[PDB]
Amino acid sequence: IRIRLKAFDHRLIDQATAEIVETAKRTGAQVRGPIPLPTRKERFTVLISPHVNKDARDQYEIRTHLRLVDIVEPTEKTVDALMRLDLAAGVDVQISL
Amino acid sequence: MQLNITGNNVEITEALREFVTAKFAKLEQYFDRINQVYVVLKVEKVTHTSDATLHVNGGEIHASAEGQDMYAAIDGLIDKLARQLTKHKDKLKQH
Amino acid sequence: PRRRVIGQRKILPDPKFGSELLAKFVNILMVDGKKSTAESIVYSALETLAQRSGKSELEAFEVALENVRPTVEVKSRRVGGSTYQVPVEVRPVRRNALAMRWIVEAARKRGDKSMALRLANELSDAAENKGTAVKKREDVHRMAEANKAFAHYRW
Amino acid sequence: GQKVHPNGIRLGIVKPWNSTWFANTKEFADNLDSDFKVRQYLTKELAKASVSRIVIERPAKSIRVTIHTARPGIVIGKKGEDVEKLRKVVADIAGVPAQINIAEVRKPELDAKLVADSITSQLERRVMFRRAMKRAVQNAMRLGAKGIKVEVSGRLGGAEIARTEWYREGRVPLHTLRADIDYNTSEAHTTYGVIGVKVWIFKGEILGGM
Amino acid sequence: KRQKRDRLERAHQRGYQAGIAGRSKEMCPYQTLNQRSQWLGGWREAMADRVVMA
Amino acid sequence: AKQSMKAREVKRVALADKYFAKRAELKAIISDVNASDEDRWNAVLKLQTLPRDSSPSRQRNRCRQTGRPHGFLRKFGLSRIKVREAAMRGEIPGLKKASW
Amino acid sequence: NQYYGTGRRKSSAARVFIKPGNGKIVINQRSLEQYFGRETARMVVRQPLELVDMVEKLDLYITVKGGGISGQAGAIRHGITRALMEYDESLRSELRKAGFVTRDARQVERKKVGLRKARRRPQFSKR
Amino acid sequence: PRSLKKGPFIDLHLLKKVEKAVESGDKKPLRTWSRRSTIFPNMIGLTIAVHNGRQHVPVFVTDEMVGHKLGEFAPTRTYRGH
RNA sequence: AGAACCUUACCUGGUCUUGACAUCCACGGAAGUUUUCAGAGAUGAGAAUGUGCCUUCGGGAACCGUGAGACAGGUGCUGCAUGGCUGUCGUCAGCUCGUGUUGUGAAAUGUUGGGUUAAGUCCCGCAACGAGCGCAACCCUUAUCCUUUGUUGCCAGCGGUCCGGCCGGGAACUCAAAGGAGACUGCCAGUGAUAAACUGGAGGAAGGUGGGGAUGACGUCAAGUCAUCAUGGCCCUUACGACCAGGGCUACACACGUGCUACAAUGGCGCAUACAAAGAGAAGCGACCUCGCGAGAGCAAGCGGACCUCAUAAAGUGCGUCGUAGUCCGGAUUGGAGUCUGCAACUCGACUCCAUGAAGUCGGAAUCGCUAGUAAUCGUGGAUCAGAAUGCCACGGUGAAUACGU
Ligand SMILES: [Mg+2]
Ligand SMILES: [Mg+2]
Ligand SMILES: [Mg+2]
Ligand SMILES: [Mg+2]
Ligand SMILES: [Mg+2]
Ligand SMILES: [Mg+2]
Ligand SMILES: [Mg+2]
Ligand SMILES: [Mg+2]
Ligand SMILES: [Mg+2]
Ligand SMILES: [Mg+2]
Ligand SMILES: [Mg+2]
Ligand SMILES: [Mg+2]
Ligand SMILES: [Mg+2]
Ligand SMILES: [Mg+2]
Ligand SMILES: [Mg+2]
Ligand SMILES: [Mg+2]
Ligand SMILES: [Mg+2]
Ligand SMILES: [Mg+2]
Ligand SMILES: [Mg+2]
Ligand SMILES: [Mg+2]
Ligand SMILES: [Mg+2]
Ligand SMILES: [Mg+2]
Ligand SMILES: [Mg+2]
Ligand SMILES: [Mg+2]
Ligand SMILES: [Mg+2]
Ligand SMILES: [Mg+2]
Ligand SMILES: [Mg+2]
Ligand SMILES: [Mg+2]
């Protein structure tokens, strides 16, 4: 089983990882290493004056962070627990068999 | 001397155009090498105003004047540029 | 500028003849960042310089260079209503830069077919005191000689 | 000249966001319009509850909304009659099951947004603008602000010409990024038109991103 | 642009220029005796040259 | 934006996604080379009949706060102005000033 | 017992392995003279060897990814000078004096708002 | 121009009211805002007064006018000179 | 940050009047759904079908239609009544306050003086003593190294191979991203007021603010915006409000500004062949296959993506040709023939093929940009967006010139 973790904060994500790679160890299973992935950086430019003045801008950004964790030898026990976990708000997870 | 007229809150009729052109024709005697020049006329509430900017041979001269009419505004303006143009000339013909 | 520019650059020497001098000469001919194109044009000229003088390349291209380097240039200085042309020594490195520039400038202003031909011919003519390049130096030198009286002003 | 929004600049460095969820483009614009509405509603009808901040999270097909106040009693009610009402009529517009919490603001005088309105209220009651401004800077420093600045601007005392006046005392270093400075504004609606108010409160410098 | 020019040389040429233009010694802006020596040094060299100029 | 202008956008959305299928399939035959000349010719008359405001190209993204028609951003559904205003409060998760 | 460097210039990265031998070179499963048309490139690649005359006393093996020609060529040189002063902690000082040991750093400047490029700014004629 | 496969475009309203012209022979001019519509062969012989923005203007259709689009015969700007 | 319609605020003509957009009240009718006709359409008149969910025996809850009037509505006016936001001098090194002292007083001192610095930077003096807003530092990025983790990324040593990281393996290396290490005038000479600093040297990936960004003092210009929004006042209310079709914003004797492409041989054309970065995609990015000279069409894998797709970088390089011509330079203009988006491309789209083949031979007076991975030059992506970049915002490739000096 693979779970991909994704979020806007980096401290926040490096929690959920540690949380999951604690349970996986708990409910007897081998977890194949939290491996980080390229972080997408959507960028935006906007006129900051409400009229005229083209050369006056802000440059905004959203950094998305991706993490991947595997499940080597999925115990029957684990599959329920790693499914049943209330996980920090503002974090998307995608467990997929 | 190539001219250009604007109106910011003023309709440029064909006195105010004809008038302004004649008044500006003098300035060349103060300095022969005037190039393109832009004029702007304003009316804000009660204040009549007239500014122009003059591209000259190695410079940029600007002034603005306020009248109770626009004619009196432009009359004032021409006296301001005259003095600046003479100052310019004299710090080139500086021997 | 008002302060001193710190940090001079590093010209790599030529791939062939391994000279920083010739490497500069390429840059000067180079256009729009096309260093390879210029690298070709230069060598093909020296070929055709070598193939007639029969006097090496890094030693022939030199002889052109000596016929054309100036030793005294004029600086302009506004005095009263007038402008004083005044003679000054030329720095060694500068007179290299000028020679190499005048050679290139003279080349381009010709009717020959290739660029390589123009350069070659010009370098050859240079070696026998002939082309526009060498004409220019002569003229420079004439002017500094004329208004020698203003040699020692510091103003 | 113009000045950067002191909250905005310090967002990652030393401040939090007010809304903290994650979404893909598909539902990103939709969570924004949803949030807007809930704030638009809450602030409207908690007007008189002294509310500082409405931080609002979307955990997993849901929404918990945790709304800072210096009068929690009035928000809660008689063992939570009003709170559940709010809950009922948020889930209404959030489009999902909602739950609500009540954070406690201990020192309302050291809260940029609270003090900002405090003034805006006084000004609405034809109070002298210098008195309002002067009072605030006292209160703040009295309770351990390391600094405080309040600006007010518009047609002060109904004057035919508009101007801008401000007092500071203590440190308010806007260029220092780790400096926790709390900033917020409030428009006041006198009969002469809008008087804008702005407030900066320095609480000291921080040594850790957290 | 990256680093300030020699202070002594500059001081010597400032001296020269006040010299030729005919200001008095005792306009010298330096009390740092080191720079001062450069300034006057220029100013006196310049006094020679003025003579043979018109 | 004038209340009216905000409104038209609702009239226009509603239709667009009610006749959505009718248009699609009624278009689908038009572009079918291998179909009855009788059919396709009918269709051309039939599409032009059902109402204009029911076309998706007829609508205009307006800020869903102020109604502005210009300087829209899809990611937020807001104008450049309101995006900035909200950005600075921290009402847009993640978003923040950027340097590189 | 093979000695290794990484090496970077502009956007290039060059992982290199040297071994004692007669003076072979491979870049990305290819020979020097093949991979690099330009002459400059070649000069640059071997000039650390040409310095400490091991031109034909060691046999090199390379791969590069990213950048253009003068980037890769440059990145390789750095790669060698790293390995070549690791096989021999001795040579450093000589290598260093040639200025091969430093990693260049010069990157392309970003485009900025209001400008046509990094520093080129749109015309306005006082004409 | 319109793809060949999609056939020639005419607004229906106008398409209809040049059956009654051609079947139930009339001899009146027809009003129309249908500047889109291309001229079909049926339209040969019938004046039809197409809108230009402020006024309708008569276009006595002919063989030569076939395929072109009505509005291609109702100029919409006035200019004499300067 | 993208006017065919829409947008749209304008013009012409056709309509509407408690109104297109709300709350309140009475009355009627579930809401929907499917049709014909007239009309440019708005709209008007018909026709079919339908009778729902808690309702405790009155139905309330929908959501629709008519009626009354408290009202809604206005991109109408004033940016010289305002808030908010923004340009500008200027990322210039300034601008001030408390107490003390001096002066009848406006004021002054501090903030001057000697040095120093990018810097009111720092030091030493001194009727000043202190403090604050700025300066610098804290933030992001880039340059080197180390730890942890290793798939969708990686292949040094092995073994196998359909020779394709392709396979078993490997966790080295490149790279991905969390956490750390590092640069401080710290170390060494010489100068210097036993200072502050300066100039040079060492090591080091980097040296003196390493490079680039973010960050804009008190104020100035009744600068800009009542058409983003809000808002004092004033004005309109069967019309300055509302709906619709067509047109207009794309008009052309002309003047000015910003760009693109050229005028050729450091080049045009044909064949052959190398090396990037950054970014986008959900009902979207759309391969492979078939069709077509081509724009494209049909069919339909994979991919919410370090995996799939956009999507083959170009200049470069080799071989050939053209031979200095208004040319095998240029590609404007125009005819013919198409494709695609879209109710719809006449006014007014982008692109394709065939034909056409203009001005232009390097630009008067004037005038602009740029000091290094910069200028110059070459390609790539994105936002807006049904379709509509030579603009804007980003990304790499190649890669100079010259600074004596004031
Ligand atoms: Mg992506
Ligand atoms: Mg007079
Ligand atoms: Mg700003
Ligand atoms: Mg409104
Ligand atoms: Mg549209
Ligand atoms: Mg611009
Ligand atoms: Mg570039
Ligand atoms: Mg229109
Ligand atoms: Mg009308
Ligand atoms: Mg103003
Ligand atoms: Mg105005
Ligand atoms: Mg006294
Ligand atoms: Mg001062
Ligand atoms: Mg003072
Ligand atoms: Mg003083
Ligand atoms: Mg001083
Ligand atoms: Mg200071
Ligand atoms: Mg050093
Ligand atoms: Mg700073
Ligand atoms: Mg004004
Ligand atoms: Mg219309
Ligand atoms: Mg226009
Ligand atoms: Mg160009
Ligand atoms: Mg051609
Ligand atoms: Mg796109
Ligand atoms: Mg084919
Ligand atoms: Mg500079
Ligand atoms: Mg380009």
Short mmCIF file of N, CA and C in Angstrom, two decimals, chain D residues 78-182:
data_model
loop_
_atom_site.label_atom_id
_atom_site.label_comp_id
_atom_site.label_asym_id
_atom_site.label_seq_id
_atom_site.Cartn_x
_atom_site.Cartn_y
_atom_site.Cartn_z
N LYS D 78 -26.70 30.61 27.80
CA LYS D 78 -27.24 29.91 28.96
C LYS D 78 -26.97 28.41 28.78
N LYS D 79 -25.80 27.97 29.26
CA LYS D 79 -25.22 26.69 28.87
C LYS D 79 -25.40 26.52 27.35
N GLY D 80 -24.86 27.50 26.60
CA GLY D 80 -24.57 27.34 25.18
C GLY D 80 -25.83 27.26 24.33
N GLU D 81 -26.70 28.27 24.45
CA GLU D 81 -27.90 28.33 23.62
C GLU D 81 -27.54 29.01 22.30
N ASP D 82 -26.74 30.08 22.37
CA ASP D 82 -26.42 30.88 21.20
C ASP D 82 -25.42 30.14 20.32
N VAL D 83 -24.42 29.52 20.96
CA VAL D 83 -23.35 28.84 20.25
C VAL D 83 -23.93 27.77 19.33
N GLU D 84 -24.85 26.95 19.86
CA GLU D 84 -25.44 25.90 19.04
C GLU D 84 -26.23 26.55 17.90
N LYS D 85 -26.94 27.65 18.19
CA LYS D 85 -27.65 28.34 17.13
C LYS D 85 -26.66 28.68 16.01
N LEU D 86 -25.55 29.36 16.36
CA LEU D 86 -24.55 29.73 15.36
C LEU D 86 -24.17 28.48 14.57
N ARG D 87 -23.86 27.40 15.30
CA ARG D 87 -23.46 26.14 14.70
C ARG D 87 -24.50 25.73 13.65
N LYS D 88 -25.78 25.70 14.07
CA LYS D 88 -26.86 25.30 13.19
C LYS D 88 -26.80 26.11 11.89
N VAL D 89 -26.64 27.44 12.01
CA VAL D 89 -26.81 28.32 10.87
C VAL D 89 -25.46 28.61 10.19
N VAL D 90 -24.38 27.94 10.63
CA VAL D 90 -23.14 27.94 9.87
C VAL D 90 -23.19 26.75 8.91
N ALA D 91 -23.33 25.54 9.48
CA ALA D 91 -23.50 24.33 8.69
C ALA D 91 -24.51 24.56 7.56
N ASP D 92 -25.44 25.51 7.80
CA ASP D 92 -26.37 25.98 6.79
C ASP D 92 -25.61 26.44 5.54
N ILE D 93 -24.60 27.31 5.71
CA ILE D 93 -23.96 27.98 4.58
C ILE D 93 -22.62 27.32 4.25
N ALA D 94 -21.96 26.69 5.23
CA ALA D 94 -20.74 25.95 4.93
C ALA D 94 -21.07 24.80 3.98
N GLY D 95 -22.31 24.27 4.07
CA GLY D 95 -22.75 23.16 3.23
C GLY D 95 -22.27 21.81 3.77
N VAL D 96 -21.85 21.77 5.04
CA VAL D 96 -21.25 20.59 5.64
C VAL D 96 -21.54 20.62 7.15
N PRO D 97 -21.31 19.52 7.92
CA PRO D 97 -21.46 19.59 9.37
C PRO D 97 -20.39 20.47 10.02
N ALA D 98 -20.85 21.41 10.86
CA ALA D 98 -20.01 22.45 11.44
C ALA D 98 -19.94 22.30 12.96
N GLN D 99 -18.83 22.76 13.54
CA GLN D 99 -18.69 22.85 14.99
C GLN D 99 -17.90 24.11 15.31
N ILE D 100 -18.14 24.68 16.50
CA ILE D 100 -17.67 26.02 16.84
C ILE D 100 -16.99 25.98 18.21
N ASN D 101 -15.89 26.73 18.35
CA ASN D 101 -15.19 26.83 19.61
C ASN D 101 -15.06 28.30 20.01
N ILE D 102 -14.64 28.53 21.26
CA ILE D 102 -14.60 29.87 21.82
C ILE D 102 -13.27 30.05 22.56
N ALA D 103 -12.33 30.74 21.90
CA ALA D 103 -11.06 31.12 22.51
C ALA D 103 -11.27 32.39 23.34
N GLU D 104 -10.43 32.54 24.38
CA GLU D 104 -10.60 33.61 25.36
C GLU D 104 -9.46 34.61 25.20
N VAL D 105 -9.83 35.88 24.95
CA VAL D 105 -8.89 36.98 24.89
C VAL D 105 -8.83 37.61 26.28
N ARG D 106 -7.68 37.46 26.94
CA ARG D 106 -7.53 37.83 28.34
C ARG D 106 -7.37 39.34 28.49
N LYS D 107 -6.57 39.95 27.60
CA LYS D 107 -6.17 41.34 27.70
C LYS D 107 -6.73 42.10 26.50
N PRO D 108 -8.02 42.52 26.51
CA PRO D 108 -8.63 43.12 25.33
C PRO D 108 -7.99 44.43 24.89
N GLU D 109 -7.25 45.06 25.81
CA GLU D 109 -6.59 46.33 25.56
C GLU D 109 -5.31 46.12 24.75
N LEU D 110 -4.79 44.88 24.75
CA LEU D 110 -3.60 44.53 23.97
C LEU D 110 -3.98 43.74 22.72
N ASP D 111 -5.08 44.11 22.06
CA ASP D 111 -5.53 43.42 20.87
C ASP D 111 -5.85 44.43 19.78
N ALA D 112 -4.96 44.51 18.78
CA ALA D 112 -5.05 45.52 17.74
C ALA D 112 -6.49 45.70 17.26
N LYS D 113 -7.18 44.60 16.94
CA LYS D 113 -8.50 44.69 16.33
C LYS D 113 -9.51 45.23 17.34
N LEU D 114 -9.43 44.75 18.58
CA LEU D 114 -10.34 45.19 19.63
C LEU D 114 -10.18 46.69 19.86
N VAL D 115 -8.95 47.14 20.14
CA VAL D 115 -8.73 48.56 20.42
C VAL D 115 -9.18 49.36 19.19
N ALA D 116 -8.86 48.89 17.98
CA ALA D 116 -9.23 49.61 16.77
C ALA D 116 -10.71 49.96 16.79
N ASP D 117 -11.57 48.97 17.07
CA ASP D 117 -13.01 49.20 17.07
C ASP D 117 -13.39 50.09 18.25
N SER D 118 -12.78 49.83 19.41
CA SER D 118 -13.02 50.64 20.60
C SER D 118 -13.09 52.12 20.21
N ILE D 119 -12.07 52.58 19.48
CA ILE D 119 -12.00 53.95 18.99
C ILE D 119 -13.15 54.22 18.03
N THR D 120 -13.25 53.40 16.98
CA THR D 120 -14.24 53.57 15.92
C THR D 120 -15.63 53.76 16.52
N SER D 121 -15.91 53.06 17.63
CA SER D 121 -17.16 53.21 18.35
C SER D 121 -17.26 54.61 18.95
N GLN D 122 -16.26 54.98 19.77
CA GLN D 122 -16.22 56.31 20.38
C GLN D 122 -16.47 57.38 19.31
N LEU D 123 -15.73 57.32 18.19
CA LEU D 123 -15.84 58.32 17.14
C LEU D 123 -17.27 58.38 16.61
N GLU D 124 -17.95 57.23 16.53
CA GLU D 124 -19.32 57.20 16.06
C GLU D 124 -20.23 57.95 17.04
N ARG D 125 -19.84 58.00 18.32
CA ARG D 125 -20.61 58.69 19.35
C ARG D 125 -20.05 60.10 19.58
N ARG D 126 -19.62 60.76 18.50
CA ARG D 126 -19.14 62.14 18.51
C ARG D 126 -18.16 62.41 19.65
N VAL D 127 -17.35 61.41 20.02
CA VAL D 127 -16.36 61.59 21.07
C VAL D 127 -15.14 62.29 20.45
N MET D 128 -14.39 63.05 21.27
CA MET D 128 -13.24 63.77 20.76
C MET D 128 -12.13 62.79 20.37
N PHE D 129 -11.65 62.94 19.13
CA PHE D 129 -10.79 61.94 18.51
C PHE D 129 -9.45 61.87 19.22
N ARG D 130 -9.00 63.00 19.79
CA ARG D 130 -7.74 63.03 20.51
C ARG D 130 -7.87 62.24 21.80
N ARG D 131 -9.04 62.33 22.46
CA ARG D 131 -9.26 61.62 23.71
C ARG D 131 -9.17 60.11 23.46
N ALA D 132 -9.90 59.63 22.44
CA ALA D 132 -9.89 58.22 22.09
C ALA D 132 -8.47 57.74 21.83
N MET D 133 -7.77 58.42 20.91
CA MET D 133 -6.41 58.07 20.55
C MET D 133 -5.49 58.06 21.77
N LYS D 134 -5.59 59.10 22.61
CA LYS D 134 -4.67 59.26 23.73
C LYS D 134 -4.90 58.16 24.76
N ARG D 135 -6.19 57.85 25.02
CA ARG D 135 -6.57 56.86 26.01
C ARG D 135 -5.93 55.51 25.67
N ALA D 136 -6.04 55.09 24.40
CA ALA D 136 -5.62 53.76 23.98
C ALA D 136 -4.14 53.53 24.27
N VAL D 137 -3.29 54.51 23.94
CA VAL D 137 -1.84 54.35 24.07
C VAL D 137 -1.47 54.19 25.55
N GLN D 138 -2.20 54.88 26.44
CA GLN D 138 -2.06 54.66 27.87
C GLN D 138 -2.38 53.21 28.20
N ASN D 139 -3.64 52.81 28.01
CA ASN D 139 -4.09 51.47 28.36
C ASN D 139 -3.05 50.44 27.93
N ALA D 140 -2.63 50.52 26.66
CA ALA D 140 -1.78 49.49 26.07
C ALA D 140 -0.49 49.35 26.88
N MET D 141 0.25 50.46 27.04
CA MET D 141 1.55 50.42 27.69
C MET D 141 1.40 50.06 29.16
N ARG D 142 0.29 50.51 29.77
CA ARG D 142 -0.02 50.18 31.15
C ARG D 142 -0.01 48.66 31.35
N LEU D 143 -0.47 47.91 30.34
CA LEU D 143 -0.64 46.47 30.44
C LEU D 143 0.50 45.71 29.78
N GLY D 144 1.59 46.43 29.42
CA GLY D 144 2.85 45.78 29.11
C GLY D 144 3.11 45.66 27.60
N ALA D 145 2.45 46.49 26.79
CA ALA D 145 2.89 46.67 25.42
C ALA D 145 4.33 47.20 25.44
N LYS D 146 5.20 46.61 24.61
CA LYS D 146 6.54 47.16 24.45
C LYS D 146 6.47 48.39 23.54
N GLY D 147 5.40 48.50 22.75
CA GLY D 147 5.11 49.73 22.04
C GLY D 147 3.70 49.71 21.45
N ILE D 148 3.29 50.87 20.92
CA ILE D 148 1.92 51.07 20.47
C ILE D 148 1.92 52.30 19.57
N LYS D 149 1.17 52.21 18.46
CA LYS D 149 0.94 53.35 17.60
C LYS D 149 -0.49 53.28 17.09
N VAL D 150 -1.18 54.42 17.09
CA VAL D 150 -2.52 54.48 16.52
C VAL D 150 -2.58 55.71 15.61
N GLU D 151 -3.04 55.46 14.38
CA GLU D 151 -3.29 56.48 13.38
C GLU D 151 -4.79 56.55 13.13
N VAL D 152 -5.28 57.78 12.89
CA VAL D 152 -6.67 58.04 12.58
C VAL D 152 -6.70 59.13 11.52
N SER D 153 -7.65 59.05 10.58
CA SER D 153 -7.59 59.90 9.40
C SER D 153 -8.95 59.98 8.71
N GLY D 154 -9.15 61.09 8.00
CA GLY D 154 -10.46 61.48 7.49
C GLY D 154 -10.81 62.88 7.98
N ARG D 155 -12.12 63.17 8.01
CA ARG D 155 -12.63 64.47 8.40
C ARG D 155 -12.76 64.51 9.91
N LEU D 156 -11.62 64.71 10.58
CA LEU D 156 -11.57 64.70 12.03
C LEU D 156 -12.39 65.88 12.53
N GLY D 157 -13.12 65.68 13.64
CA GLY D 157 -14.02 66.69 14.17
C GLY D 157 -14.79 67.41 13.06
N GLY D 158 -15.29 66.64 12.08
CA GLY D 158 -16.20 67.14 11.06
C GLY D 158 -15.59 68.26 10.21
N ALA D 159 -14.26 68.35 10.19
CA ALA D 159 -13.56 69.42 9.49
C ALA D 159 -13.80 69.30 7.98
N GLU D 160 -13.89 70.45 7.30
CA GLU D 160 -14.18 70.48 5.87
C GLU D 160 -12.99 69.92 5.08
N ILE D 161 -11.79 69.94 5.68
CA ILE D 161 -10.58 69.41 5.06
C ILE D 161 -10.08 68.21 5.86
N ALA D 162 -9.62 67.17 5.15
CA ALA D 162 -9.22 65.92 5.78
C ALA D 162 -7.75 65.95 6.17
N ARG D 163 -7.41 65.28 7.27
CA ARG D 163 -6.02 65.20 7.70
C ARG D 163 -5.80 63.87 8.44
N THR D 164 -4.54 63.63 8.85
CA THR D 164 -4.12 62.35 9.38
C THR D 164 -3.23 62.58 10.60
N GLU D 165 -3.64 62.03 11.75
CA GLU D 165 -2.92 62.25 13.00
C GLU D 165 -2.61 60.91 13.66
N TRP D 166 -1.48 60.86 14.37
CA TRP D 166 -1.00 59.62 14.95
C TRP D 166 -0.11 59.89 16.16
N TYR D 167 -0.29 59.07 17.20
CA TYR D 167 0.62 59.04 18.34
C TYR D 167 1.32 57.69 18.33
N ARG D 168 2.57 57.69 18.78
CA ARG D 168 3.28 56.47 19.12
C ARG D 168 3.86 56.64 20.52
N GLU D 169 4.02 55.54 21.24
CA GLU D 169 4.99 55.49 22.33
C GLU D 169 5.55 54.08 22.39
N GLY D 170 6.76 53.93 22.94
CA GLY D 170 7.44 52.64 22.92
C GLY D 170 8.03 52.35 21.54
N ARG D 171 8.50 51.10 21.35
CA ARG D 171 9.09 50.66 20.09
C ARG D 171 7.99 50.10 19.19
N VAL D 172 8.03 50.44 17.89
CA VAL D 172 7.17 49.79 16.91
C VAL D 172 8.00 49.57 15.64
N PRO D 173 8.96 48.62 15.65
CA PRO D 173 9.89 48.44 14.54
C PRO D 173 9.32 47.60 13.40
N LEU D 174 8.83 48.27 12.34
CA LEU D 174 8.10 47.58 11.29
C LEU D 174 9.06 46.86 10.33
N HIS D 175 10.32 47.28 10.27
CA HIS D 175 11.28 46.68 9.35
C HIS D 175 11.81 45.35 9.88
N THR D 176 11.78 45.15 11.20
CA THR D 176 12.25 43.91 11.79
C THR D 176 11.16 42.85 11.64
N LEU D 177 11.54 41.69 11.09
CA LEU D 177 10.59 40.70 10.61
C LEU D 177 10.15 39.78 11.75
N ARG D 178 11.09 39.41 12.63
CA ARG D 178 10.76 38.55 13.76
C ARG D 178 9.92 39.30 14.79
N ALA D 179 9.88 40.63 14.69
CA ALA D 179 9.12 41.44 15.62
C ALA D 179 7.63 41.12 15.49
N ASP D 180 7.07 40.52 16.54
CA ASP D 180 5.64 40.31 16.64
C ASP D 180 4.98 41.66 16.83
N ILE D 181 4.44 42.22 15.75
CA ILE D 181 3.62 43.41 15.86
C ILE D 181 2.22 43.03 15.39
N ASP D 182 1.21 43.33 16.22
CA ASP D 182 -0.18 43.05 15.90
C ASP D 182 -0.81 44.29 15.28
#
